[PDB]
Design a protein around this ligand. Sequence first.
Ligand SMILES: NC(=O)c1ccc[n+]([C@@H]2O[C@H](COP(=O)([O-])OP(=O)(O)OC[C@H]3O[C@@H](n4cnc5c(N)ncnc54)[C@H](OP(=O)(O)O)[C@@H]3O)[C@@H](O)[C@H]2O)c1
Ligand SMILES: CCc1nc(N)nc(N)c1OCCCOc1cccc(CCC(=O)O)c1
Ligand SMILES: [Cl-]
Length: 163
Amino acid sequence: SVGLIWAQSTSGVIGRDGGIPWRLPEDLAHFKRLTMGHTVVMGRRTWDSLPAAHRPLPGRRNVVVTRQTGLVAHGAQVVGSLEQALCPAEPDAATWVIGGAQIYALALPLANRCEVTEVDVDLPPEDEDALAPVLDQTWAGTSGEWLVSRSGLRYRMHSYRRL
Ligand SMILES: NC(=O)c1ccc[n+]([C@@H]2O[C@H](COP(=O)([O-])OP(=O)(O)OC[C@H]3O[C@@H](n4cnc5c(N)ncnc54)[C@H](OP(=O)(O)O)[C@@H]3O)[C@@H](O)[C@H]2O)c1
Ligand SMILES: CCc1nc(N)nc(N)c1OCCCOc1cccc(CCC(=O)O)c1
Ligand SMILES: [Cl-]
């Protein structure tokens, strides 16, 4: 079972300028709760985007997908394709693909679950933005209530499963 987890603005933006263009502590807490103890698979750009105290993400098996031969990622396992990341020598009951846009597009056909945070922040897309995948009719989901963060942003969590 492979799941995707991401946070997006309502407009679909997930990344800008090498980072995430809002601050939402409640989403980071949700991400920690869903992923702790499990495998997290990410593209190399997302690995390079992690803040220092989160590189590697503590308490998870970190896997980094790159085409670079010989890349060392201290605290993570380096693999050469998403398929390799999903064929571990040591199986894990739960594997989460945690971004970014390039890796989500490769992972979506292989996944059966998506956990999405929607953030009500106005971000007209800009040309180098990383965008969320769009879930088609093969997916169905459920939505939590709109909540207000302690920092003031409206947000809500959606849970999708493959039909
Ligand atoms: N809001 C969220 O939930 C969320 C989550 C994660 C990331 N983000 C944001 O998203 C952005 C990063 O996303 P991104 O789309 O630019 O990059 P990405 O998907 O994280 O990483 C892209 C890299 O993955 C490797 N890769 C891609 N396709 C591959 C393939 N077929 N085989 C092997 N390796 C492959 C390449 O690494 P090499 O160049 O090393 O070969 C490529 O440069 C950042 O802004 C980050 O902050 C947001
Ligand atoms: C929490 C974002 C997130 N949220 C969900 N729901 N799914 C994800 N895959 C997801 O990204 C996980 C990879 C990035 O991890 C961190 C971890 C800690 C602090 C930051 C700040 C980024 C900034 O402020 O630029 C980023
Ligand atoms: Cl974390």
